Amino acid sequence: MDNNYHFWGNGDRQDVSLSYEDYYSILDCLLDEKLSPQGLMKFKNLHEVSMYGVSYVPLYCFPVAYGISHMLTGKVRRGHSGYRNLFSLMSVVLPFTCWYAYTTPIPRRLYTEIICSNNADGAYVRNRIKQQKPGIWRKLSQQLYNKNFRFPELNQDLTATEFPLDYVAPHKF
């Protein structure tokens, strides 16, 4: 498909998907002293990709917010004359569309390398999310198990001798 599959800020459909809200919350519960210089490099690349992405998301959502605000006013296009109502409805609706976008997980190679890496950095990140962010880890564990990832930190772990630390949502065995 694309000619830039090597890019770290890129991803395919079956990569680990984290919304921007989840990514920032995950960042809020980590320490740089506990990560190797490679893990810090992964996090810095993710930081630059994500700063550009969070800058751009409202631009992505602007056409949909514009259309919805137009449809709320009516079936009359008063360009340059309905700007006041259009942009009040925009300042209301564009936050809602951006809410839907920012709560939408998006796949990334850096997301799938930070979480699913088998070295000590991956285990540290997984356990830190498991303990400090139980809900984020609930969703993320469901996603990882669905993607044929087998880690001890997953709630859906049939080989464990210890009971899960959260509610195990129904899934196909």
Partner 1 sequence: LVRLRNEYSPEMDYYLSNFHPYEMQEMGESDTTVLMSPYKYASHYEYTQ
Partner 2 sequence: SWAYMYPWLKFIFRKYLDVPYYWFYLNGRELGIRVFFTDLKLFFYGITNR
Partner 3 sequence: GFETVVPAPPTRDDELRMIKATEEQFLQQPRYKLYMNEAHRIAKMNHGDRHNNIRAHFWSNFALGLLITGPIFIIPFGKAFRNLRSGVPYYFRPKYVFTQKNQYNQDRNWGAMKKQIPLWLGLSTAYAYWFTDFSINDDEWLEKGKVIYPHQTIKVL
Quick one: which of 80, 159, 170, 171 contacts partner 1 (CB under 8 A)?
Answer: 80
Shortest reach from residue 13's CB to partner 3, in Å:
17
For residues 161 and 144, what is the distance between their CA atoms, to the nearest angstrom?
Answer: 20
| 6: Cα separation from own chain's centroid | 20
Token pair 């002293």 is found at: 33
For residues 116 and 123, what is the distance between their CA atoms, to the nearest angstrom?
Answer: 8
Q: Running DSSP on this structure, what letter comes out for residue 100?
A: H
Q: Which residues are near ligand CDL by CB under 6 A?
A: 80, 83-84, 87-88, 91
SS3 106: strand
Residue 2: contacted member of partner 2, partner 1, ligand CDL, none (CB under 5 to 8 Å, by partner type) = partner 2
Please tell me whether residue 17 binds partner 2 under the rule CB under 8 A.
yes
Please tell me whether residue 75 binds partner 1 under the rule CB under 8 A.
no
Please tell me whether residue 78 binds partner 1 under the rule CB under 8 A.
yes
Count of Cβ atoms closer than 10 Å to residue 173 Cβ:
5
Residues engaged in binding partner 2 (CB under 8 A): 2, 4, 7, 9-13, 17, 48-49, 51-57, 59-60, 91, 101, 104-108
